[PDB]
Structure formats: C-alpha cells, structure tokens
Amino acid sequence: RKNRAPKRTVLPDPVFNNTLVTRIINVIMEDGKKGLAQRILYGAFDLIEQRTKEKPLTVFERAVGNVMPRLELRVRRIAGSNYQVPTEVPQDRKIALALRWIAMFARKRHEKTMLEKIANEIIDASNNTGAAIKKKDDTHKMAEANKAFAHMRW
Amino acid sequence: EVKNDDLELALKKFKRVSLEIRRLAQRHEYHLRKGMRLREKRKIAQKKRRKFR
Amino acid sequence: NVSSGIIHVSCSPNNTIVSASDPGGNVLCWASSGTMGFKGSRKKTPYSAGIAADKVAKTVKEMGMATVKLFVKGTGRGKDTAIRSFANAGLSITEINEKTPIPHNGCKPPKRPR
RNA sequence: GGCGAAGGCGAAAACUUAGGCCAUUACUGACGCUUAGGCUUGAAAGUGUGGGGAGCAAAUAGGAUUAGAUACCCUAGUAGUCCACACCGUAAACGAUAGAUACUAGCUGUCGGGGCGAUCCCCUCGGUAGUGAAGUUAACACAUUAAGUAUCUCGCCUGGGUAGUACAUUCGCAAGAAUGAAACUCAAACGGAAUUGACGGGGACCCGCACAAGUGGUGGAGCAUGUUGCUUAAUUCGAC
C-alpha cells in the first residue's frame, strides 16, 4: 500500500485566464512540446472566433459542463464473472476525465487537419452530440442500473 | 410483537425483536444431528456467559 | 375503496414479495422483484425490495389508502428497505408486527449444504 | 443445569414402578468387595410380518460445474426414517481414566438435604464444576471426583505389516458377530509428548510501479543483434 499522495500545482494561463485551459494544453501535448500544442489550441481558438462567433471561454465552459460525467465505475469482484460497482468521484477527476475524453475523441475523426477536427470536437461538446456526450451518457446509463451494488459496497 | 405508537421509537425494538426472531428461525430450517443441537446450544450459552457475563 | 387495511411483505432469502390486503382477508394487489425488468440472481437485493415497495405503495395510493397494519414476513436483508420506502412515502402506517412462518420444533427441515 | 449403571431422558395428564439423598439412641449381627462361567440391558444402521407414510432423505433420473464427476450445488425421487411383535449386539458405546476402601494443602463456585433463619448470607452432610500446594507424570497434564500415598479382585498388553485376516468352533434368516493365528517381510511404525523452522486456498498487522489511476511501449510489418534446432569443415567454448 501507501499513504495519501500530494498533488503538484498547475498554474493558470494569464492570457485567457483559466487553469482548465492549461490542463487542455497539457493533455493535448505530445512528445513534451508546449509550443506545437499551444499553436494548435490557439488556432482552434481563432477558429472559434471565426465561425460561430462567440466567446471562446463561454463555449469552453459549456463544453466542460456538458461533457463532465456525473458518476464513475469501480471494479470490486468476488469470483468469476466479475461485477462492477458505481461510486462517487470528486469534481477534479471529473473534469480531468472530461478533458481526456475531449482529447482522445478529437484525434478520432474525419477532417484530417487537427485544427478543424479539434474545433469541431469542442463545438460538438458544447452542442451535446454523439462525439463525446454519447460516451458520458453510456457510462451514466450503466450506472444507476446496478445501483443496488452501489448502495451496499465498500 | 405488536408495538408502534407514532413514528420510530418502536422501530429500534423492532430491529431487536427481528434479530432475535432471525436467530430463533435460522436453527429450525437446516437439519443436522441432535448432538450438534446440544453442542451448539452449549456453545451459544458459553458465548453469552463469557461476553455478557 | 377502503381506508383501513393491511399490507404484507415476505422477504425470502432468495426473493421478496409484497401484497396489500383488505381486513377481510382478500388481496388488493401484489408486487415482487420479478415484476421489474431485472431478473436472475440480482433480484435478492434490498434496493429491489425497496423499489417493489415503492411501486406497491404507489399503486395502492390511487385506491385511496389510509392507516394500515404492517405484518413483515421472511428473513433477509431487504425487508427493512420496504420499511424505509413506506415511512418516506408518507403513508399512515400505524402498527408493526412479526409474522414469519415460525414453527415449533416439529417437522424435519432440509440439510446442511456442504 | 437435573436424573439414570450404561445407552439415554425436556408440550400436558393419569396408573404401575425404579433407584437415589439427610439425621437416624431403632433392629439384625460381618450377612462385605471383586466376580471366571451364567444371566440382563445395550445409540444408529440393518432383517422378517402388518400397519402407517406430512416432511426429510440412501439408491436412481435430470439440470449445472469441470478435462472428466458414477461427488460437492440444484429439481425430483425409492428403501428407510414412525407404531405393534420377534432378531441382530456393533459405535470416537470416551472422562480414550475397571470396581471397592482409607488418608493427604488450599481457594472460588454451583445444586440437593438439615438446622438457625424474608432471600441475602452461617455452618453441617452429599453430588456436580473451576483454580491450585506438595506428590506423581516422558511431557502434556492430574491433583480430595487423582493419573498421589497403598491394599483386594477382575480384565487386558508384549514391535510394525501381514490382520482383527485365514482355518476350526458357537450364535444368527441373513448381513455378520464372538473367538483368533501363522507362513513371509521390515528395522523400524499413520509410535506418544514436546521444540526450531517451513508451509497453509489460518488469522492480526505492515510495505513496495505491487494492486489501483494514468501515460508510453512489446506480441502485427520490415531490418539490427543474441539465443534454440538443422547443416556442414569448424559453424570454437560457456551462460539455461
């Protein structure tokens, strides 16, 4: 086992003034290169002003609010043919998983160029389509179906 | 066991009586030898005499 | 069509049944874990008994139900959830009682599984 | 907790009947203990005859699990499980401790009888438990209910496997029971107690990129390289 693990701090970006944007730029990073992902995300921002003219922060928070999952799933088995257990997860991991879903689903689509695909991903997340809201809805629907296990668990 | 006045004060004793009813009902639903009856009864009596004193 | 009545619940170790009855002995309606969609081994849960009791309380509400006796039957961990369902339902429960089919030490029961 | 010699005995009542406990100036006057042989009883299962048969449940069928399952689980399901009359006479029938007698520190209880006497307590005579001295014990442990101090009697034992088997004999409808070896073989044994470890699908507690979470890779392609096998002149030798 181990004890409780402290978390390293993440600094907000003082240009759009949101630390969730910093977690965006962190998760969408590959190879350990802030510059390339930074240009990608800022081009996506410029596209947000370009089509569907609206505050990028507003569509950002709307996408975060729609994609966030209400409940999580935890494995607690007894014997063969294991059974799941839905438990409660704090908001930090909830937004972390929402961002992870946005990142993974963005790089799974048509419109080959990253700029338009990630922009369409954030647009769909704001508008509640099957791109990512489908996954959250499914993971919610497996929850509260076997909630009898959730009530009596440990 | 009829006892209930307004809301809940009866319910605690209801849990007590339900526990003792379950205790008395479990040992009359599965068959095994009479010697086992006697030995388990003495074991339960010993538990009561050692824990509750 | 009656104010007073009695509703019976029998929480078996493998299932549960709830049944609302008039004082004349006739049944009004019954409910069980099988009435709901989920079946198989997962029906012996306190949550299932709770939702069954919720549904039976609902379907007796339109009947115009009032103060009612409560006879609880069977052994299991799901009988008390029906108590919570009925108490939270706002019904006029008045008396609780124990009606397990308890025998004196007579007929020989089945064995130890082993 | 109580009673019974043992097996056993617990919803209620009547009849018959057993033995038991305390004080007994009463009576009798050693009439006692043990008991080969003999006799009586003796859990469950099983046998014969007639009933009875709710539930349970050998055997049997089916559904699952498994590699197989003639098992563990589930659904049925026969004998039997119950009563009346006869038989079998075995059990871890154990306190694994034969019966009888007297003595030997103590303490805590509990139950029955007597007296004092609201129970509560006091003591007396007994049974039944726990703790514990010396003493005994290979050790564990026993210790006033001894496995101690001794006596009387009965029964029993003489390495293990063969084997509680064979032959004979008695009983029994039978199942079988009682009695009970040897040939051969081993140098020890499902020997006993206790000790250190080890192990446990035994518990209690605690760590670790162990689990959990995430990220990124190998098994998919091709090339580099090492290894296994084959080959030849060696494909030098080891690392497994």
Side-chain angles (χ1 to χ4, degrees), chain A residues 1-150 154, chain B residues 2-48, chain C:
Chain A
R1 273 78 58 181
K2 78 169 311 169
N3 311 64
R4 189 175 262 153
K7 60 183 178 294
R8 45 157 56 191
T9 311
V10 287
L11 320 172
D13 186 8
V15 64
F16 306 88
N17 189 359
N18 191 341
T19 189
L20 308 186
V21 174
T22 72
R23 315 196 76 143
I24 297 295
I25 201 63
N26 184 280
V27 299
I28 66 174
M29 181 156 38
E30 293 83 3
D31 164 78
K33 186 175 288 183
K34 297 165 82 74
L36 183 64
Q38 189 81 290
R39 281 165 54 240
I40 295 295
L41 181 65
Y42 289 170
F45 273 110
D46 283 89
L47 196 151
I48 299 173
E49 292 84 4
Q50 172 203 26
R51 49 167 309 290
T52 69
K53 293 213 89 72
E54 165 60 349
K55 175 59 66 68
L57 177 65
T58 301
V59 56
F60 182 76
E61 53 84 14
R62 198 174 91 187
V64 163
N66 296 295
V67 177
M68 61 79 71
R70 200 53 46 86
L71 277 296
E72 62 158 36
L73 201 40
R74 278 197 329 118
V75 289
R76 300 203 86 104
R77 65 171 66 181
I78 288 298
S81 179
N82 63 7
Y83 66 104
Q84 323 311 338
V85 166
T87 57
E88 300 68 40
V89 63
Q91 72 303 330
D92 62 358
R93 213 179 191 280
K94 289 164 53 84
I95 64 172
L97 296 172
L99 271 66
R100 289 169 173 174
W101 281 323
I102 300 318
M104 65 179 288
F105 281 153
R107 191 205 74 64
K108 187 176 294 298
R109 201 173 272 178
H110 187 273
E111 57 263 37
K112 32 201 182 175
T113 302
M114 187 66 204
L115 276 298
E116 297 74 1
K117 71 169 57 144
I118 190 167
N120 185 9
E121 211 75 40
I122 186 160
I123 283 289
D124 297 331
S126 59
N127 294 320
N128 302 72
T129 65
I133 304 295
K134 180 176 71 68
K135 209 272 176 185
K136 191 262 291 184
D137 181 28
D138 291 331
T139 61
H140 186 77
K141 185 173 74 174
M142 283 74 75
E144 73 193 322
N146 54 87
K147 200 148 59 181
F149 280 112
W154 70 86
Chain B
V2 291
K3 64 182 181 293
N4 181 358
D5 302 65
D6 305 315
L7 183 63
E8 190 276 331
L9 193 143
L11 200 49
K12 185 94 80 193
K13 314 142 181 293
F14 172 81
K15 273 84 72 173
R16 317 269 281 148
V17 297
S18 82
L19 172 66
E20 64 86 13
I21 281 299
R22 183 177 178 179
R23 172 162 35 248
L24 189 152
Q26 272 163 193
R27 66 185 184 273
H28 289 57
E29 72 93 10
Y30 272 14
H31 169 226
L32 73 165
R33 294 180 313 112
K34 300 294 187 291
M36 290 315 186
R37 296 290 186 270
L38 268 294
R39 184 172 165 261
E40 171 285 350
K41 184 178 184 293
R42 287 183 293 275
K43 176 69 175 69
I44 295 308
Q46 197 282 332
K47 285 179 68 67
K48 307 300 104 176
Chain C
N1 297 120
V2 71
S3 72
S4 184
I6 311 96
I7 177 157
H8 293 95
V9 60
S10 170
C11 176
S12 187
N14 202 359
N15 207 352
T16 187
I17 190 167
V18 69
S19 303
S21 182
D22 63 358
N26 293 323
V27 298
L28 313 183
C29 184
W30 54 256
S32 83
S33 73
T35 44
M36 283 73 74
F38 57 90
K39 68 154 284 303
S41 60
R42 64 221 81 201
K43 67 184 173 66
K44 43 182 178 184
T45 60
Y47 175 48
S48 175
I51 79 173
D54 291 331
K55 181 179 178 294
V56 71
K58 179 179 73 68
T59 184
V60 66
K61 283 279 195 182
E62 293 83 4
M63 183 278 288
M65 173 46 108
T67 191
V68 61
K69 264 64 187 159
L70 201 43
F71 292 112
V72 65
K73 181 184 175 183
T75 186
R77 267 189 262 156
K79 67 175 72 175
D80 64 352
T81 307
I83 298 284
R84 297 284 74 78
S85 66
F86 273 39
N88 302 12
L91 183 62
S92 313
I93 193 66
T94 184
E95 212 61 14
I96 188 54
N97 204 25
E98 182 36 35
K99 285 215 310 200
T100 191
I102 186 63
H104 307 171
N105 57 5
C107 63
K108 187 162 82 69
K111 59 191 276 174
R112 293 292 86 192
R114 59 90 174 174

